[PDB]
Design a protein around this ligand. Structure first.
Ligand SMILES: CC(C)(O)Cn1nc(-c2ccc3cc(OC4CC4)ccc3c2)c2c(N)ncnc21
Length: 464
């Protein structure tokens, strides 16, 4: 058996995805950079057996298509699976799209043709995505012309998805109805793609609602409409493909492969025949609203999660250090700080960035250097822990402020309670619950909160 960390060193965290963290890693010999998805066996249950997982992995490694993330290597130890793939630096598609000021059916067809091309290839090889959504569409690089790379093709079959809301934000919009009821095949990926297309041309989800369950209720009925004013600007051809992708009964839904031949794809992907190319201004602005909303809700939930973790870890670390403190003087040396922090990781295991003893030593060293000025031998375990725990908080609180600022597009400094409803509905915090909380933060408020007030609301919503 091969050991992951004998071959790769963790450089930095790329983000948090379905089933676990993705870490930028580097081969310790060749220097090749890779994006490693680390799946915690304790947080993510397997659906299949080891036989079946290894076969899929072995197949996946052999597949090559320009629109599918390349898998290079697969590792397993006691506590995790490590999926090693190519790293892409262009970010999520929609985050790129909202940075444009011009966006047309030609742009959308370029995009969707890639997606369908990737899907078609994977379906030929009898791999289904099932959880296809905009997060799973990355851009190869930061270029304008960058190819799309679909991530996470095949994992859904072998791993059971988190039931935590922080992990399933914006899943409901894209799931095919047959997935909800249990009998599904590869046509579910066409539906998901159709939802994404609808969004690209209108900037609104076709199936929408105030909370996760209302969205699902709409999905399951399967009814949607084109009566939004911004569809008047959209080709009939595009709407036709949409209807075919959003066909309820899977045996009647267009295949990925056939979707590629559809008139709309054939017409709007000719690099030069731009016969009518208006820019879909309303759509792009709806998408920017949509995206900012999703990202703020996500950030709020991870903020609350981080605050709950730091309660847990602070107490556990203190108890570990306390017991290591044989003097009772409240001081410890470096090796002991490292040992307890490893003992913490021994227990916690939510920290894929600490892939070996070498990662731990350096985090501890970041903190001991950060202890401002240094006396060597006898260190006040109390303050360490304060600062060691106070990293992650602000790191996930920075993102909160960033996301608040990004959502507040008119730079008003505040969020209206209408907007709060939308954000909390998306985050699935019950309506009565968040208003009670508001009322306690600012007893005088007039239907809007600034960043600090919003933050105070979140703290109350995670039991502080
Ligand atoms: C927010 C994040 C962390 O998920 C962003 N992210 N996530 C990934 C990513 C996402 C899923 C992966 C899955 C893997 O297993 C293969 C797909 C089946 C291997 C690497 C994977 C890498 C990523 C990447 N390759 N390059 C740049 N950013 C990436």
């Amino acid at each position: 058996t091969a050991i992951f960390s004998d071959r790769y060193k963790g450089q930095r965290v790329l983000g948090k995805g379905s089933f676990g963290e993705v870490i930028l890693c580097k081969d310790k010999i060749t220097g090749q950079e890779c994006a490693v998805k680390v799946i915690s066996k304790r947080q993510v249950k397997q659906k299949t057996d080891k036989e079946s997982l290894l076969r899929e992995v072995q197949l996946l490694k052999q597949l090559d298509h320009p629109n599918i993330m390349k898998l290079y290597e697969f590792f397993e130890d006691k506590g995790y699976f490590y999926l090693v793939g190519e790293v892409y630096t262009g970010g999520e598609l929609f985050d790129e799209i909202i940075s444009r000021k011009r966006f047309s059916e030609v742009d959308a067809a370029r995009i969707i043709r890639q997606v369908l091309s990737g899907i078609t290839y994977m379906h030929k090889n009898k791999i289904v995505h099932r959880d296809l959504k905009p997060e799973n569409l990355l851009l190869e690089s930061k270029s304008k012309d960058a190819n799309i790379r679909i991530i996470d093709f095949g994992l859904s079959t072998h791993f059971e998805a988190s039931k935590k809301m922080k992990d399933k934000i914006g899943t409901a919009y894209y799931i095919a109805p047959e997935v909800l009821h249990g009998t599904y095949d590869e046509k579910c990926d066409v539906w998901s793609t159709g939802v994404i297309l609808y969004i690209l041309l209108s900037g609104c989800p076709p199936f929408n609602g105030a909370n996760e369950y209302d969205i699902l209720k709409k999905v399951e009925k399967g009814k949607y409409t084109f009566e939004l004013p911004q569809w008047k600007k959209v080709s009939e051809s595009a709407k036709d493909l949409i209807r075919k992708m959003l066909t309820y009964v899977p045996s009647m839904r267009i295949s990925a492969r056939d979707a590629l031949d559809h008139e709309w794809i054939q017409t709007y992907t000719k690099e030069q025949i731009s016969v009518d190319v208006p820019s879909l201004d309303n759509a792009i602005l709806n998408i920017r609203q949509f995206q900012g909303t999703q990202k703020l809700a996500q950030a709020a939930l991870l903020y609350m999660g981080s605050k709950l973790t730091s309660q847990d870890e602070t107490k556990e670390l203190t108890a570990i250090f306390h017991k290591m403190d044989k003097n009772g003087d409240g001081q410890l040396d470096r090796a002991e700080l490292i040992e307890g922090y490893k003992e913490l990781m021994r227990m916690k295991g939510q920290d894929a960035s600490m892939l070996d003893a070498s990662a731990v030593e350096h985090e501890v060293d970041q903190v001991l250097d950060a202890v401002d000025f240094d006396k060597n031998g006898y260190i006040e375990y109390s303050e360490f822990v304060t600062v060691a725990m106070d990293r992650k908080t602000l790191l996930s609180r920075e993102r909160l402020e960033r996301a608040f600022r990004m959502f507040d597009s008119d730079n008003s400094g505040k969020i209206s309670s209408t907007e709060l409803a939308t954000i909390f509905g998306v985050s699935d915090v019950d309506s009565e619950t968040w208003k009670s909380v508001l009322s306690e933060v600012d007893k005088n408020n007039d239907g809007e909160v600034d960043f600090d007030e919003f933050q105070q609301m979140l703290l109350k919503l995670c039991g502080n």
